[PDB]
């Protein structure tokens, strides 16, 4: 039963500006055999279906803008968002494939 | 274009069964698993099971939550996912998607649109 735990809960920025959300593991998702990290991160626009961001903890999904970078290793990950856009409300949740899925509980974005 | 579909949404009494459909297109079904997520209005998004695929002899596995309430089978001449959902409980009123899966990215990197289930007395 891995618990990953995120913060804030919720958080508001202006656009242009840079965020910052943890997400805490219970257990290392750091895999030995082929070192990678078995965190990813999804977007969900409000209404909306979710959205791969970055899985192996770091690697940006095809297609994602590079003002979203993950980064951490074995407990301890984070997602940042380099210059908001109007765009990147939504939650984001990270979730740990280490062992199955399990999804945290949501950092929600809002823009004013 | 990768699509995702659901379908098998709507009023389901408590108690009751529901099976939920997901057909797909524009990627070789077989080479990857397929899970189901909810969410529930207002909550988290909570990952229920997936189906592996063709190298991983398409076993299953599913959420301690609904582990023998909830079925996951799929249609490999079809390429569709489906979700068998047993005893319906209030709690189990949500939004329902099919997402693509499996250990290239160990992560949901395409998602249908959803369906959702409303368990009303
Ligand atoms: O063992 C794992 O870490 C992993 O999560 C990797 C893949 O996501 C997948 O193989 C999964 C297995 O299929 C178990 O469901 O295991
Ligand atoms: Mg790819
Ligand atoms: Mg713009």
């Known amino acids: 039963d891995i618990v990953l735990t995120q913060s804030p809960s919720s958080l508001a920025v202006s656009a242009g500006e840079r965020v910052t959300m943890s997400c805490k593991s219970s257990?290392?998702?750091?895999?030995?055999?082929?070192?990678?990290?078995?965190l990813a991160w999804y977007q969900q626009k409000p209404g909306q279906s979710p959205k791969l961001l970055i899985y192996?903890?770091?690697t940006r999904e095809s297609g994602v803008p590079d003002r979203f970078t993950g980064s951490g290793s074995g407990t301890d990950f984070t997602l940042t968002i380099n210059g908001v856009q109007a765009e990147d409300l939504a939650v984001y949740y990270c979730?740990?494939?280490?062992?199955?899925?399990?999804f945290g509980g949501g950092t929600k974005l809002e823009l004013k | 274009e990768v699509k995702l579909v659901e379908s098998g949404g709507g009023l389901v009494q408590p108690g009751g069964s529901l099976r939920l459909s997901c057909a797909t297109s524009?990627?070789?079904?077989?080479?990857?698993?397929m899970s189901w997520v909810r969410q529930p209005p207002g909550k988290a998004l909570e990952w229920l099971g997936f189906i592996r695929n063709k190298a991983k002899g398409y076993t299953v596995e599913y959420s301690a939550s609904v582990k023998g309430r909830f079925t996951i089978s799929r249609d490999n001449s079809q390429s569709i996912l489906y979700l068998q959902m047993n005893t319906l409980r209030a709690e189990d009123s949500a939004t329902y998607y099919c997402?693509?899966?499996?250990?290239?990215?160990?992560?949901?990197?395409?998602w249908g649109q959803g369906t959702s289930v409303t368990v009303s007395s």
């Open positions: 979730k740990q494939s280490y062992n199955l899925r399990t």
């Open positions: 997402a693509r899966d499996g250990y290239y990215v160990d992560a949901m990197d395409y």
């Open positions: 524009g990627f070789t079904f077989t080479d990857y698993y």
């Open positions: 257990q290392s998702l750091f895999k030995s055999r082929n070192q990678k990290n078995y």
């Open positions: 192996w903890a770091s």
